[PDB]
Design an enzyme around this catalytic site. Structure first.
Site, short mmCIF file in Angstrom:
data_model
loop_
_atom_site.label_atom_id
_atom_site.label_comp_id
_atom_site.label_asym_id
_atom_site.label_seq_id
_atom_site.Cartn_x
_atom_site.Cartn_y
_atom_site.Cartn_z
N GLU A 35 -5.50 7.66 -12.20
CA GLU A 35 -4.51 7.81 -11.13
C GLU A 35 -3.14 7.20 -11.50
O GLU A 35 -2.10 7.79 -11.23
CB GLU A 35 -4.98 7.17 -9.81
CG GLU A 35 -6.10 7.89 -9.04
CD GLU A 35 -5.75 9.31 -8.59
OE1 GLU A 35 -4.56 9.70 -8.58
OE2 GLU A 35 -6.68 10.07 -8.25
N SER A 51 4.93 14.49 1.02
CA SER A 51 4.22 13.21 1.04
C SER A 51 4.41 12.57 -0.33
O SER A 51 4.99 13.18 -1.23
CB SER A 51 2.72 13.43 1.27
OG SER A 51 2.15 14.11 0.16
#
Length: 130
Positions: A35, A51
């Site tokens: 990530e 977002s």
């Protein structure tokens, strides 16, 4: 801050992540690696739905934290997304726990499914003393 592998392993363990909702520490380590590369100030903007993903676990602003600029968003972790860019990851860890409390569990992150699900994750904690 960018964590060194074993440093992060022990940091996550002291925070009660090993086996939280059945997810081994190694899995958490594999998630963070893919990530953000263990980078607590990693951010990614999604132009499509306006977002953004924040921190070491790249947690999304549509549902988990508030950044005041994501249309129609919620804040399930009841945290400003800024709390997800701190060098100290306690808040990010509390939020990641909240995330896996939902139906999908660790599968909430597509990256985990792609690089960790069914693959070898034991390699991530080896030699870390955890």
């Amino acid at each position: 801050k960018v964590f060194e592998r074993c440093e992060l392993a022990r940091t996550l363990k002291r925070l009660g992540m090993d086996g939280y909702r059945g997810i081994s520490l190694a899995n958490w380590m594999c998630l963070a690696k893919w990530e953000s590369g263990y980078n607590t100030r990693a951010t990614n903007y999604n132009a499509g739905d306006r977002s953004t993903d924040y921190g070491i676990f790249q947690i999304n602003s549509r549902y988990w934290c508030n950044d005041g600029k994501t249309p129609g968003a919620v804040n399930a972790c009841h945290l400003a997304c800024s709390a997800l860019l701190q060098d100290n990851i306690a808040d990010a860890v509390a939020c990641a726990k909240r995330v896996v409390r939902d139906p999908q569990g660790i599968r909430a992150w597509v990256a985990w499914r792609n690089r960790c699900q069914n693959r070898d994750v034991r390699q991530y904690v080896q030699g870390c003393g955890v």
